[PDB]
Amino acid sequence: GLIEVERKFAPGPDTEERLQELGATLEHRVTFRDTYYDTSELSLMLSDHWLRQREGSGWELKCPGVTGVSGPHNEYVEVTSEAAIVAQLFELLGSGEQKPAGVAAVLGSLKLQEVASFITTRSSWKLAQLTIDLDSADFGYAVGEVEAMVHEKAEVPAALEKIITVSSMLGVPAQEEAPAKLMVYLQRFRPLDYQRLLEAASS
Ligand SMILES: Cc1ncc(C[n+]2csc(CCOP(=O)(O)OP(=O)(O)OP(=O)(O)O)c2C)c(N)n1
């Protein structure tokens, strides 16, 4: 799959106006459920893999990036082929000897269960490209991301530059590193999982 490069930010009262003034256009709005899966030991998340089923899109696996871009920014390979997702799940959790099947069909054999499920309403903008998604979660939390998707690693630096420039033109504090919706959900509603992630990040 493709390499996603992103920077999250806290959206302000002026964000639409600022986007308008930059020449970004609002492409669509959409409301949808995401459901994230892991083992009881959080084997995926602790290895920086994120498996989800998204209403309207199907199964998606985020795999850790190949280049060094972490900080307020981050980089993931997004895998959307179910066959590719299963192949990676077998390697991480099970055996490559297992019979391939759809992601839903293998969950039970790999002891994968729902760790999080929540609805989001997303207002999606395009800049000529970059995408800027302004999200509101159904547990009460709002976040934005400036994002680019590239094919090869050598395109990452140039994408990363635009992402920073656009966040800055939005007037988003440089220091700010707004958390992912999933991380706020885990903090509020899966506190023992959240602590496990904390203890592993400081390690
Ligand atoms: C402290 C910390 N923060 C973030 C991460 C990375 N991370 C946390 S959750 C998580 C999975 C959810 O990522 P997210 O960017 O919030 O998805 P979303 O915006 O809704 O959808 P999309 O852009 O595909 O449409 C990742 C990759 C990490 N490992 N540690």
Numbering used by the authors: 4 to 131, 141 to 215
Text of the article:
The Vtc4p β-tunnel domain is not unique to eukaryotic polyP polymerases but is a structural hallmark of triphosphate tunnel metalloenzymes (TTMs), whose characteristic features are the presence of a topologically closed hydrophilic β-barrel, the preference for triphosphate-containing substrates, and for a divalent metal co-factor (PFAM families CYTH and VTC). Our comparative analysis defines that most of these enzymes share a common catalytic mechanism in their tunnel centers, yet they have evolved different substrate recognition modes on their tunnel entries. The observed substrate plasticity apparently allows TTM proteins to act on a wide array of enzyme substrates and to perform very different reactions, many of which likely remain to be discovered.
We thus structurally characterized a mammalian TTM ThTPase, which was previously shown to specifically hydrolyze thiamine triphosphate (ThTP) into ThDP and Pi. We synthesized ThTP from ThDP and produced co-crystal structures of mouse ThTPase with its substrate at pH 6, where ThTPase catalytic activity is minimal. Consequently, we found an intact ThTP molecule bound in the tunnel center of ThTPase. The thiamine portion of the substrate binds to a pocket generated by the tunnel walls and the C-terminal plug helix, with the thiazole ring making a stacking interaction with Trp-53 and with Met-195 from the plug helix. The ThTP triphosphate moiety binds in the same conformation as outlined for the PPPi-bound structures of AtTTM3 and ygiF above. Both the N- and C-terminal sides of the tunnel domain have evolved to recognize specific substrates, as exemplified by our ThTPase structure and by the class IV adenylate cyclase complexes.
